[PDB]
Subunit: 244 residues, 6 copies
C-alpha cells in the first residue's frame, strides 16, 4: 500500500468542471427552504393559512423575528393573536431545522407579497422609506427587506443585475446596522461581508423561475419591459458606490 | 400537484390592502402599558380608597421613582409604613411586569390628565427641576415634565403642530433619561432618543382617551390654542430640542 | 365601567397644593432617623451612652463606618474597646433598618457635638483642615463632616443660606472624592449629584428647631448675630463657585 | 564517587554531531497533519467509494470550510443528507483532532495534487476569490489559493526560487487568514504571518511526496519552468507580498 | 418625657475636651503590626534559638520577601530546609494576618534597630539596591532602605527635621513600592504615596521604643547630629523626593 | 519581660558581615538544582541517559518545555519517542520539585553541550541566529539560550564579565519577548527585570568551577586566552546598550 502513489494517481484523476460545479451548488449556503415553508404553512394552517401568513409577514416587518419577545410589549388583542399563531404554527426563532417555521421565513418564502407590502409598511420599518430617501431620491420601497433577494432574476444582463443588487445593498447596509448595533462602527465592506451570503443564496435559489422573478421586477417598476433598471434603482446603485 | 411555486405566485397576486394591513400594524404595535387594565386593577384592589391612593402613588412616582422597595430604605417611619401598605394592597412591582401587575409609573401614565397637572405643583421636587428646564428653554411647560404626558397628545393635530409638541416634550425626555440613568452618560441626543421614542409614540397613538379629549387637555394646559396651534413656550422648547446636544 | 370616563373624572379632581406637598414631605428621602438613633443609644448604653457615643463619633470621623474592618488594623486595647461597642450597641455597617445603629448615624444624630469635635480632629480627617485651607483661607472646621447639614437653619435669608451650603459643599466635593475614588474623574456637578440628596434631607429634617440650629451656627462662628455668614464662609462659597 | 560536575564536563566533551542533531530536529518537528494516516483512513472507511467521496469532501472544504456540523445548518435538504452520510461514514471531526481522526481540511491537504487543480474551477466560490487576489497581484496563481498548496512545494529548489514561491503563496495566506477570522482584524502582516507560517513550513518540509514529484506538480501547474524558475505571475505575487500591509 | 431633641442639645453642651479626644484618636489609630506581641511570640516559639532565628528571618525578609512558601519554590535544598523548619517552629504566615501570627516582615519591623543596621551589609541584594538609590540621590542612607525604618523615627523632632527624615525615607518607599508591585505601574508619586504613608505614620507614632531611644538610633546611624539636625545625605534625599515623579 | 529592652539589646548585637552574607547565599534564588538533575537522569536512564539527554536538549531548544503539548503536533515516530521519554524519566512541566525533571532543566544542567548545540540549531530556535545578526554582526550562537548563564565565570575582570553578560542579555531581551508576548510592549529595563534573576543565579551557582567555566568560554571563542571578550561579544554588548 503505497500512499504516495495513491496520492499522485488521485491527482491524475480528471478535474470534471460539470461534476465539481454541481457539488458546489449542492453544498451551497441556503438561508431557508421556501418549498418546505409553504408546505408547513398549508399543513398547520389549513383554510386559514393565507390570511395568517399575511399577519405573520406584517409581524416580521414591523416587530421582528421573536414572537415571544414582541408579545411582552403588545395590546391584549395583539398578544392573543400572536399566542394563537405560535401554538397553531409552532413558530420558533432564529435558525431552527427546515421542518420549523419562523416569521422571517414566511416573509422570505412569500416575497412576492412581502415586497408589495413594504410600500404600505414603509414608515413602520426599522429603516423607514423617508430615511432611505435622504440617501437616494425615491428609494424603491419594494427593495426594503432581505426578502427582496428572492425576486432578483440572475439572468438579467450583468450591468442591470449589478444595479439591482447595488441598489438593494444600500438598504441592506442601513438595515444591518440598525438590527446589529455592533456593525455601526464597521466599514461598508465589512457590513457587506455579513449580508451578501444570504442575499446571493436567495438570488440564485431554485425557487421562482427567472422569467417569473423578472415579471415581478417589472410589475414592481424596478425594471422596464427591456429589463433596464429604473432611474430610482440607478440612483440607489450610485449612492451605494459612494456610501460609507 | 403540490406546486409550491404556483402557490407562492398566486399568494403574491392577492390584495395588498392598505386599510387591512394598517389595522394589523395597529393590532401588533408596541404597547408600553395597558391603561384600562391599570384602572381596573386600581378599582379592584382599592375599592373606596382607590382615588386617594392613586394620587399618593403618582406623587410617589414623580418624586421618588418606580422602585417601591428601594425608596423605602431611605424614608421616614411614617412614609415607609404608607408605602408598605400600598405595596401589599395594590401588589406593586418594579420595572416592566405583565399586564396584570401594577407599578407606580403605570398609575401615573394611566391617569396622565391628573399627573400632568400635578407637575405644576411638583416642579422643584422632580429629578429634573423646572428651574433646570428653564435654563435650556425659557418658561418650559411643566405639564410636559413626565413621560405620562405622551398620553395627552392628539395625533390628529396638524403635522407641524404635532411635531412641535413632541419636540418640546422630547427636550425634557432627553434631560430626564440622562439624569435617572448615570449609565447613559456619554451618548448622543439621537442615542438617548432611541431609548424614549418607542414608549412615547405608543402613548401618543394609543386608543386610550379620544383624540378630541386629548386636545381638550392640551388646550386646558395652555399648550395649544383653540385651533391646536402650540404656545410660544412650546415653540421655544421645540427649537431648543433641534439645537440640543 | 367606562375606564376613559373614570380617567377624565380623575383629571377633574382638585390639585390640592397643601395635600400634595404634605405627601412630598412624607415620602421624602431620609438618610437616618435621629430620634430613633438616640433612643437606641440610651437603650443599649444606659448610664454609659454619652461617653460611648463620644468614642463612636471619634471612630466615625477618624477611622470610618466599618467597625469590623477598622478592628483589623488597631491596637489590642483599641480593638477590645470597639469589640465591646459592637456587642453592646449591636453596631452594623452601611444602611440597615432604622432600628439599627451605625457609627455614622451616631455622628449625624449628635451633630452639635460632632461639628465641635472637628476643630480638634482636623488633621486626622480623610480631608484635613490644612488641605481645605489651600482651597479657601481659614476653611471652617465645623463644616468638615456630612453631619454638619443637620446644623443648617433653612429659614436663614436665601443669600445667607446659599453661602452656608456652598461653603459646606466645597468640603463635600473633596470628601466624596476621597471616600469614593471613582468620583475623582467626574465633574463638580456630577459629584454634587451624589452628596446633595443626603445634605438637603438633613437641612430640612424635623430634628432640632430652626432657632436652635441657628444658635449653633452663631456659636460655631459661622454666622453673626444678624445671621450674616462669616468672612470664612463667604470665601469658601466663592471657592465652590470656581471649583472643578 | 558521584561527581556530577565531572559527569557534566565529560558530557560536554561528547560529539555535537550536526547530522545526528538535524535528524532529531526532523523527528521532533511540528506536524500539522499525517497524510499517510489520512489516506489510510479514507481507504478503510470508504472502500470502493473513497475516491469520489474524497473529491466531494475537498469541494466541501474549499467552499464551506472545516466545520461539517455548522455548514449543515445552512444547506439544502439534499446537501445536508450528503454531508450527514459523509460524517457517519468517515467519522469526520472539526478543527485539529488526533492523528486517527479525519477532517475535511486534512483530506484536501493529503490530496493536494488534486486540490490545487480544483482551485482553478473553484476560484469564484472560495472565501477569498481569484478576482480579489487579482487586485493585489495581476493574474494571481489559482493553484496557490489553499493552505494545501504548501505540500506541493519542493524545498530543494534554489533559495531565491523557493522564497519567491513561498512569498507568492503567503500573499494569499495573508488575505485568507484575515477573511476566515474576523478575530484577527487589526493585526499587522507579520502578526498574521505568525499564524500561518508554522503549518506552511511543516508541509513544505514533510516526507510526503518526493522533492522531484513536488517539483513536477509545480511545473505541471505552470508555476515554475523546466529549471525551477518561477513564472512571471509568481514573481509579481512575491513582490506584492513584500510591499503588502 | 423622651425629648430626643433636648437630649441632643445637652449632649452638644458637654465638653469637647482636646486631651480626652486626642487620647481616643491614639487608642483607635491604624496599627500595622504589634511589636510587643511579635517579640513575645518569637521568645515563646524560639526559646534559646530565638535571637539567631530572628536574624535569619530578617535576612530572609530583606532579600526574598514576605512569602515563605513562595520563596521555597526557588531555593537551594539546604535553604529550603532551613525555611521549612522556620515555618513549622514559628508558624509563619504571609501578608497581614492577626496579631497572634508571625510574618517575616513583622520580625524585621519589631526589631528595626538591627534591621536598619543590616541594610548596610545587604544593600546590593535588596529589591531596590543602594546603587539604584544613589542615582536618584547621592550617597542615599542605607539605614532608610526598608519600611522597618519608620519605627526608628522620633516624632518629637523639630517639624522641619522630622519632615526631612520622612521625605528622605519616602524617596526609597516610592521606588520600593513600585518595584515589588508591577501592578502599581502607571500611577503618580501621590498615588504610590497613598499606599505607604499609613503604615509609615503608624510606626513613626507608635508607643514602641521611646522617643529618646529612637533619636539615639538616628544619631548612631549618622542620620541626625546631636541636636537632631539631619545629615547632608538626608537633606539631599528630601529634596530629591520633592522633585521626584 | 521588657520587650522594649529586649529590642534595644537585639539592636546592640553584632552585625556579622560573614554570617549575614552566608545567609544571603543560602537563601538565594535558585532556578534549578544541577546536581539533582544529573542524578535523576542517571537513575531513570541507566545506560541510555546520555543519548536521551541529547534528544531532550534538542526538544527543549526546538519545541519548548511542555512534552505533552508538543506531542499534539508531531510525527507518529516523534510522538512515540517523546511518550517513551515522559514515561521513563517522569518528565514534568514548569517548576516542579527538585526531585522532578523537565526538558529545560536537562538543558540547563548540561549547558556545556547545550551551548555547542546552538551552533547547529540556530535557524530552528524561537529567535534565530539570522535575526540576532541583524541586531549585532556575527552574534555568538553559544549565547542563544538561558542555559548559557551557567557557563559564565563570575571571576572574570569586571569589564570582561559585564561585556559577556550584556552580550548575552541582547539575546535574552529578544527571547523573553517571543516566549512571553505580553513583554513586547514593555521597555528593555522591564524585560530585564524578568530575566536577570535566573541569569545571575546560574552565573553565581556552585555548579562547574570558575576555571572550568572560563575554559568553556575560551573553547567557545567568547573570550581569548587572556579572558578578553571577542569582537563579536563586544559588538553585542554595545548593541544591548542602545537596544529598546
Ligand atoms: O437561501 N435562499 O434560498
Ligand atoms: O403604551 N401606551 O399605550
Ligand atoms: O435624613 N436626615 O434627617
Ligand atoms: O504537517 N504537514 O506534514
Ligand atoms: O504599626 N506600627 O506600630
Ligand atoms: O539557579 N541556577 O543554579
Ligand atoms: Na426571498
Ligand atoms: Na385615542
Ligand atoms: Na446631621
Ligand atoms: Na518529501
Ligand atoms: Na514611642
Ligand atoms: Na546553566
Amino acid at each position: 500500500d503505497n500512499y504516495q502513489e495513491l496520492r499522485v494517481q488521485f491527482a491524475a484523476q480528471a478535474v470534471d468542471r460539470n461534476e465539481i460545479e454541481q457539488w458546489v451548488r449542492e453544498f451551497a449556503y441556503q438561508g431557508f427552504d421556501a418549498r418546505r415553508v409553504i408546505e408547513l404553512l398549508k399543513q398547520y394552517g389549513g383554510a386559514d393559512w393565507e390570511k395568517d401568513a399575511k399577519k405573520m409577514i406584517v409581524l416580521a416587518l414591523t416587530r421582528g423575528n421573536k414572537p415571544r419577545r414582541m408579545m411582552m410589549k403588545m395590546s391584549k388583542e395583539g398578544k392573543a393573536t400572536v399566542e394563537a399563531l405560535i401554538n397553531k404554527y409552532k413558530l420558533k426563532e432564529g435558525n431552527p431545522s427546515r421542518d420549523e417555521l419562523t416569521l422571517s421565513r414566511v416573509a422570505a418564502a412569500l416575497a412576492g407579497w412581502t415586497c408589495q407590502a413594504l410600500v404600505v409598511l414603509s414608515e413602520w420599518l426599522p429603516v423607514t422609506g423617508t430615511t432611505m430617501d435622504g440617501l437616494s431620491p425615491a428609494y424603491p420601497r419594494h427593495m426594503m427587506h432581505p426578502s427582496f433577494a428572492g425576486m432578483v432574476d440572475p439572468s438579467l444582463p450583468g450591468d442591470y443585475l449589478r444595479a439591482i443588487l447595488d441598489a438593494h445593498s444600500l438598504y441592506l447596509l442601513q438595515f444591518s446596522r440598525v438590527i446589529n448595533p455592533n456593525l455601526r462602527g464597521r466599514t461598508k465592506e465589512e457590513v457587506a461581508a455579513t449580508f451578501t451570503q444570504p442575499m446571493n443564496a436567495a438570488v440564485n435559489s431554485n425557487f421562482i423561475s427567472h422569467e417569473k422573478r423578472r415579471e415581478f421586477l417589472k410589475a414592481f417598476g424596478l425594471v422596464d419591459s427591456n429589463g433596464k433598471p429604473s432611474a430610482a434603482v440607478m440612483a440607489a446603485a450610485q449612492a451605494y458606490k459612494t456610501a460609507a
